Amino acid sequence: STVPRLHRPSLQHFREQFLVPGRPVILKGVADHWPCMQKWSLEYIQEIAGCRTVPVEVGWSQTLMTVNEFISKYIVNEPRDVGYLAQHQLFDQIPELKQDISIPDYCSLGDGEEEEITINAWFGPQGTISPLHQDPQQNFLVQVMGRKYIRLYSPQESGALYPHDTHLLHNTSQVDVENPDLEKFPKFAKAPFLSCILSPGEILFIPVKYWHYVRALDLSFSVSFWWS
Numbered sequence: 001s002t003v004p005r006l007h008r009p010s011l012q013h014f015r016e017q018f019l020v021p022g023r024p025v026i027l028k029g030v031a032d033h034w035p036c037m038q039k040w041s042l043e044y045i046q047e048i049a050g051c052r053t054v055p056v057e058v059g060w061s062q063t064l065m066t067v068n069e070f071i072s073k074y075i076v077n078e079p080r081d082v083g084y085l086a087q088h089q090l091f092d093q094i095p096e097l098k099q100d101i102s103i104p105d106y107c108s109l110g111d112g113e114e115e116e117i118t119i120n121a122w123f124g125p126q127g128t129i130s131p132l133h134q135d136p137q138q139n140f141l142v143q144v145m146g147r148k149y150i151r152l153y154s155p156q157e158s159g160a161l162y163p164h165d166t167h168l169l170h171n172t173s174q175v176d177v178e179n180p181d182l183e184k185f186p187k188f189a190k191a192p193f194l195s196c197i198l199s200p201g202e203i204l205f206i207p208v209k210y211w212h213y214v215r216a217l218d219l220s221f222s223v224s225f226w227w228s
């Protein structure tokens with residue numbers, strides 16, 4: 001079913017109805033006028049960040065190249081393969097860019113310290129896929145450019161998601177959400193979920209340990225805030 005959308009909810013309403021019970025929600029009217037929303041474009045990103053080295057996930061492999069090279073090879077025209085500048089602390093690397101975002105006020109409801117919040121960039125073409133997995137902190141995923149299809153499964157449903165059987169990968173599902181092998185993973189079919197298309201200016205709250213799967217529908221840039 002669709003993730004609820006709420007316009008600028010109070011801190012206490014967000015706390016009581018979403019944060020404490022661990023329920024996803026999309027926050028509207030919160031990040032929609034951050035400077036990134038109007039400023040970020042391929043040209044702006046090239047100008048500010050083009051010469052800097054970033055990690056890129058290809059396919060599968062992991063490599064390093066400049067932001068300019070990433071755009072040239074994996075974003076524009078007709079890329080050979082899907083590449084994704086995923087899960088990278090770009091704003092620590094480039095303080096000028098950090099000026100264009102801010103910490104959501106709702107993070108103050110956490111028990112953690114503000115300067116321990118991990119801020120990651122997720123920048124890539126249409127068609128990037130982050131397979132179903134769970135993270136160990138709360139997340140506000142802020143959509144800046146393009147749209148993402150997102151599927152969410154509660155931690156209560158872990159038994160239907162067939163986690164990998166190693167410590168390193170136990171927070172990742174073995175299932176391909178959008179084309180599941182139901183002969184091998186029959187329990188997956190029945191597991192309930194939420195989904196949404198997250199659009200520019202919207203923030204998705206992904207509760208701590210909620211399983212999430214993410215596919216970019218367009219050229220996309222998201223910023224995640226991992227907080228406690």
Ligand SMILES: O=C(O)CNC(=O)C(=O)O
Pocket residue numbers: 122128129130135139141212214215222224
């Ligand atoms: O945006 C993506 O492709 C995936 N994002 C996450 O898993 C996250 O923000 O924790």
Ligand SMILES: [Co+2]
Pocket residue numbers: 133134135212
């Ligand atoms: Co994640």
